[PDB]
C-alpha cells in the first residue's frame, strides 16, 4: 500500500527523455555535477537550474547547501552539425563529508519565461549522486593534474569548464591583421 501511494503522489502532481545522463567529478574542494540534455529541452525558451538536495538521513542539521550553475555549449567537429549543451552545478565538498559519505539527489527545474501566467514549471529528478572517501581514495572521480593530461573522457573537460573561472575578451586590431592568436596558443602556450 505504501508503494501504491508513493506512485499515487507521483501521478498526483503530474515521457520523452529530457535528459540523457548524469556525471559528477571532484576537482579540488568542489563537486561538479553535470547533466547532458537532449533536443527536447530548449534553453532559448527555458531557464533551467540544477539543485542538489541532501538526504536528511545524513544531514541532521540546517546546512543550507548552495550551488552555482553554468551552461556549456560546445560544437562537435564544426571543421546538422551536432552542438552539445550541458548543465552543471558546482558546490563545496568539505561541508558534506562530515559522515564520510553523502547521497544527494539532483533536481532539474525548468521555468518558462514567455508565458507570464507562470504556468509550466516542470521538474525532473535526474539522478542521485553518491560519494565517499573510500571512492575518492581510489581516484575514479577526482581530477588531479599532470598525470591526467590526455583527456579521453569528456566529462573531465566539462568539469574543468564548470569549476573554473571564466573570462571572455574581445580583441580588435584596427590597423594590422590578427594571425598571432593561433601561434600564441600553439607555440608560446603549447596547447593541445
Amino acid at each position: 500500500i505504501i508503494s501504491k501511494s508513493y506512485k499515487a503522489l507521483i501521478n498526483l502532481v503530474q515521457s520523452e527523455q529530457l535528459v540523457e545522463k548524469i556525471w559528477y567529478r571532484v576537482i579540488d574542494d568542489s563537486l561538479v555535477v553535470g547533466v547532458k540534455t537532449t533536443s527536447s529541452l530548449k534553453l532559448s525558451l527555458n531557464d533551467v537550474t540544477l539543485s542538489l538536495l541532501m538526504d536528511q538521513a545524513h544531514d541532521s542539521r540546517f546546512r543550507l547547501l548552495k550551488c552555482q550553475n553554468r551552461v556549456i555549449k560546445l560544437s562537435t567537429n564544426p571543421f546538422k552539425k551536432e552542438c552539445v549543451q550541458i548543465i552543471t552545478a558546482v558546490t563545496s565538498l568539505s561541508p558534506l563529508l562530515t559522515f564520510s559519505k553523502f547521497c544527494c539527489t539532483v533536481l532539474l527545474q525548468i521555468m518558462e519565461r514567455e508565458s507570464g501566467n507562470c504556468p509550466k514549471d516542470r521538474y525532473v529528478v535526474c539522478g542521485r549522486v553518491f560519494l565517499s572517501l573510500e571512492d575518492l581514495s581510489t581516484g575514479k572521480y577526482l581530477l588531479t593534474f599532470p598525470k591526467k593530461k590526455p583527456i579521453e573522457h569528456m566529462e573531465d573537460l566539462f568539469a574543468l569548464l564548470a569549476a573554473f573561472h571564466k573570462s571572455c575578451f574581445q580583441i580588435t586590431s584596427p590597423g594590422y591583421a590578427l594571425n598571432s592568436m593561433k601561434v600564441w596558443l600553439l607555440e608560446h602556450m603549447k596547447c593541445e
Partner: protein
C-alpha cells in the same frame, strides 16, 4: 623529513596528498600529538580516513581547537594556586 626542522614531514605520494605537511610530537610515547597543514579540508579528511584505517582499535583521536589537555590543566592549576595563595 626537512633536515633543518626534523619535526616536519612533507608528503610525496603523487596524487591528492602531495604538498601536505605534518608534524608529530611524541610526548610520553602513549600520548602523541599531530598537526596537519593541508591545502583544503578534503585532504584533511582524506588523510584522517587513511590514518584511522591504519591505527589500532583503542587509539582514540581527538580534535583540538585551543590547545592540548595537559597544558590547559597545568595552566588552570597554576592560576588557581596563585589565586588561593593571594587569598591566604
Amino acid at each position: 623529513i626537512i633536515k633543518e626542522f626534523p619535526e616536519v614531514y612533507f608528503c610525496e605520494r603523487p596524487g591528492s596528498f602531495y604538498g601536505t605537511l605534518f608534524t608529530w610530537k611524541q610526548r610520553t610515547p602513549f600520548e602523541g600529538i599531530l598537526i596537519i597543514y593541508s591545502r583544503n579540508q578534503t585532504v584533511m579528511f582524506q588523510c584522517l580516513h587513511n590514518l584511522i584505517r591504519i591505527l589500532p582499535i583503542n587509539c582514540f583521536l581527538k580534535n583540538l581547537k585551543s590547545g592540548s589537555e595537559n597544558f590547559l590543566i597545568d595552566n588552570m592549576a597554576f592560576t588557581l594556586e596563585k589565586e588561593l595563595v593571594t587569598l591566604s
